[PDB]
Amino acid sequence: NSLALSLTADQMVSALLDAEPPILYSEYDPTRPFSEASMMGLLTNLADRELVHMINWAKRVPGFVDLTLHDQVHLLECAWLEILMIGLVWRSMEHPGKLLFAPNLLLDRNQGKCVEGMVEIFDMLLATSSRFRMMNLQGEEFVCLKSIILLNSGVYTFTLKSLEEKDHIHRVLDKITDTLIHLMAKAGLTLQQQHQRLAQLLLILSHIRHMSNKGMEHLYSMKCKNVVPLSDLLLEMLDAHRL
Amino acid sequence: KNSLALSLTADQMVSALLDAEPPILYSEYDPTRPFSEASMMGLLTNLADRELVHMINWAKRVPGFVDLTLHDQVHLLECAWLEILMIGLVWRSMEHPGKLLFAPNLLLDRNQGKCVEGMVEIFDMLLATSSRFRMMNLQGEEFVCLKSIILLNSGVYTFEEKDHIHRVLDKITDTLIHLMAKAGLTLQQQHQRLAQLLLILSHIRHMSNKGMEHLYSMKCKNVVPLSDLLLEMLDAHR
Amino acid sequence: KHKILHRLLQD
Amino acid sequence: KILHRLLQDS
């Protein structure tokens, strides 16, 4: 018997909102001059500290604690960059043409173009926050989409006891889908508009996967370049995708 | 600048997509069952180049795709072509558990994917998608909707021409819900099944990215000859 | 630019 | 695995 299946729609939103990680700050110094590796060093330092909060945020996600320890590791190893990217996109939603990596680090594409290869990832992140701004995404819907990424990005890459846990994950995903529809019904949307918005939101997750795959490849060349420092946890997450 | 795709009903949308379905192609009929690394990739890239020609004719027959500009049509195909080939492969492999139906005369299991290094990884992901489509009891009318959604959505955030695509995407969403309610599913089962199907597209995107990288390394090996059309579709991702 | 995709879409 | 034990801390 699990708790994630016994949660109501409002209880699902309250649990995901209380589990929201904080907005960490960057070590950015405007006095200090700026290199291609200095900017990436700030972004990789920030992502590492955010990984510590994400690991503890995932524990408070309904159903995630009911999973095998090895199953929890697999889901995070495949979704960690997706979740970082959607969090960055969500924060940058109120800043057209800029990415809010940290409250003290707001970068436009020209500042972010100082790192080669990062220009493409930068534009895709800006286009995702533009799409969220056009749709007027709500925080109740964002925390739902982020929990969907955590549970869905690693189920198709995981015997009868192992399929019982996989069938349990899909029951939690269906609970979050019911919650998304319950949120849209309160906003006055008709039954036709709820299905369209639900489809529009889940299709964006396909783009976030594309950004994470491309972002994971650029992070790999940064390792071999060896110029930008990478933490041991960030290097473990990188070895999880290549292997 | 109005299009005729938005005026079609849900039934007219299903029929237009079904009649636009590409044919099932064959591979070379040499009975040498033991494959080498170059033999298998040669047969697969030859089939992919021939299936790609029919995909372009299928794209033009997708309601709404003809209304885009020539450059917008090129962008959508350039980023979605491998996904469309993959979801088509996964669909034909549904009634063949543990095997991928590349062609009616080219059915392969995962042990045969070991002949090419790096192929067994993508092999397992494709087999896993067939199992999901099989256990979800995916219908043909739902499949043609998921394939058109990939075509219109995969490159839509890398561009009012974008509004036209989002209106057709909403049209196919209405078509998908219309198909599920037609099959007797309740309201709760409709948006749940809608969500489950669309979340698989996120994984089809992942297989495409893993497969697009594997196709780039074979260009750098220059062992399996790739067609010029396949090379131009591959160059669009770099 | 010259693309084979352009010709296949126009024919 | 660092991710293993961080999920494991209680």
- Is-contact A213 A78, C-beta < 8 A? no
- Say if the Cβ atoms of D6 and A52 lie within 8 Å: yes
The C-alpha of B140 sits at a distance from chain C's nearest C-alpha, in angstroms, of: 26
Residues of B whose CB is below 8 A from A196:
170, 173-174
Q: Which residue has the tokens 């964002």?
A: A142
How far is it between the farthest Cα atoms of chain C? 17
Q: Could you tell me whether strands A105-108 and B99-103 are parallel, antiparallel, or unpaired per DSSP bridges?
A: unpaired
Residues of C whose CB is below 8 A from B78:
5
CA-CA distance, A204 to B157, in Å (whole number)?
9
Residue C7 forms contact with B (CB below 8 Å):
no
Residues of A whose CB is below 8 A from D3:
55, 73, 76-77, 233, 236-237
Residue A69 forms contact with D (CB below 8 Å):
yes
Left (φ > 0), alpha (ψ -120 to 50) or beta: where does B55 sit?
alpha
- Backbone phi and psi for residue A105, each to the nearest 5 degrees, phi listed first: -130, 90
The C-alpha of B67 sits at a distance from chain C's nearest C-alpha, in angstroms, of: 13
Which contacts (CB < 8 Å, 24+ apart) does range B177-186 have? B177/A195, B178/B10, B178/B11, B179/B10, B179/B14, B179/B139, B179/B141, B179/B142, B179/B145, B180/B142, B183/B139
- Say if the Cβ atoms of C4 and B232 lie within 8 Å: yes
Amino acid identity for residue D8 in this structure = Q
Q: How far apart are the first and last CA of chain C?
A: 17
CA-based nearest residue to A219, from A198, A200, A236: A236
- Is-contact A42 A26, C-beta < 8 A? yes
Q: How far apart are the first and last CA of chain B?
A: 33
Non-local (6+) Cβ contacts of A133 within 8 A are A93, A94, A96
The C-alpha of B229 sits at a distance from chain C's nearest C-alpha, in angstroms, of: 6
The two tokens of residue B66 are 């003809």
The domain segmentation of chain B, as residue ranges, is 1-238
The two tokens of residue A208 are 């976030």
Q: Is A185 exposed, middle or buried (0-12, 13-18, 19+ CB in 10 A)?
A: middle
The C-alpha of B232 sits at a distance from chain C's nearest C-alpha, in angstroms, of: 7
CB neighbours of residue B92 within 10 Å: 16
Specify the DSSP class assigned to residue B21. P
CB neighbours of residue B187 within 10 Å: 14
Beta bridge partners of B99: B109
CB neighbours of residue B8 within 10 Å: 18
- Is-contact A40 A115, C-beta < 8 A? yes
- Is-contact A138 A183, C-beta < 8 A? yes
The two tokens of residue A104 are 């003290």
Compute the half-sphere exposure of residue B19: CA atoms within 13 Å on the CB side of its CA: 8
Beta bridge partners of B107: B101
Displacement of CA B12 from its chain's centroid (Å)? 22
CATH class of the domain defined by B1-238: mainly alpha
Can you spell out the DSSP letters for B110-137? GGGGGGSTTHHHHHHHHHHHHHHHHHTT
- Is-contact A111 A174, C-beta < 8 A? no
CA-based nearest residue to B208, from B106, B126, B93: B126
Deposited experimental method: X-ray
- Say if the Cβ atoms of A77 and D8 lie within 8 Å: no
HEC string of chain A? CCCHHHCCHHHHHHHHHHCCCCCCCCCCCCCCCCCHHHHHHHHHHHHHHHHHHHHHHHHCCCCCCCCCHHHHHHHHHHHHHHHHHHHHHHHHHHCCCEEEEECCEEEEHHHHCCCCCHHHHHHHHHHHHHHHHHHCCCHHHHHHHHHHHHHHCCHHHCCHHHHHHHHHHHHHHHHHHHHHHHHHHHCCCCHHHHHHHHHHHHHHHHHHHHHHHHHHHHHHHHHHHCCCCCCHHHHHHHHHHHC
CA-CA distance, A92 to A125, in Å (whole number)?
9
The two tokens of residue A181 are 């529809």
CA-CA distance, A44 to A219, in Å (whole number)?
9
- Say if the Cβ atoms of D8 and A59 lie within 8 Å: no
The two tokens of residue A23 are 């907005």
Query: Resolution in angstroms for this experimental structure?
Result: 2.5
Residues of A whose CB is below 8 A from B176:
199
CA-CA distance, B218 to B118, in Å (whole number)?
11
Q: Which residue has the tokens 């349990």?
A: A168
CATH architecture, range A1-243: Orthogonal Bundle (1.10)
Displacement of CA B89 from its chain's centroid (Å)? 7
Give the C-alpha distances (Å, rounded to integers) separating B35 from B48, B88, D7: 18, 23, 44
CA-CA distance, B134 to A152, in Å (whole number)?
18
Non-local (6+) Cβ contacts of B11 within 8 A are B178
- Per-position b or e across C1-11, b if 16+ CB within 10 A of its CB: eeebbeebbee
- Say if the Cβ atoms of A199 and B170 lie within 8 Å: yes
CA-CA distance, B43 to B116, in Å (whole number)?
13
- Say if the Cβ atoms of A73 and D8 lie within 8 Å: no
Residues of A whose CB is below 8 A from D10:
none
Give the C-alpha distances (Å, rounded to integers) separating A172 from A6, A147, B130: 10, 10, 22
Helix (H, G, I), strand (E, B) or coil at B159: coil
Q: Which one of A73, A78, A241 would you mutate to disrupt binding with D, by most D Cβ within 10 Å of its Cβ?
A: A73
Q: Is B174 exposed, middle or buried (0-12, 13-18, 19+ CB in 10 A)?
A: middle
- Per-position b or e across A102-140, b if 16+ CB within 10 A of its CB: beebbbeeeebebbeebeebbebbbbbbbbbeeeebeeb
CA-CA distance, A131 to A133, in Å (whole number)?
5
Give the chain D residue nearest A76 (alpha carbons).
D3
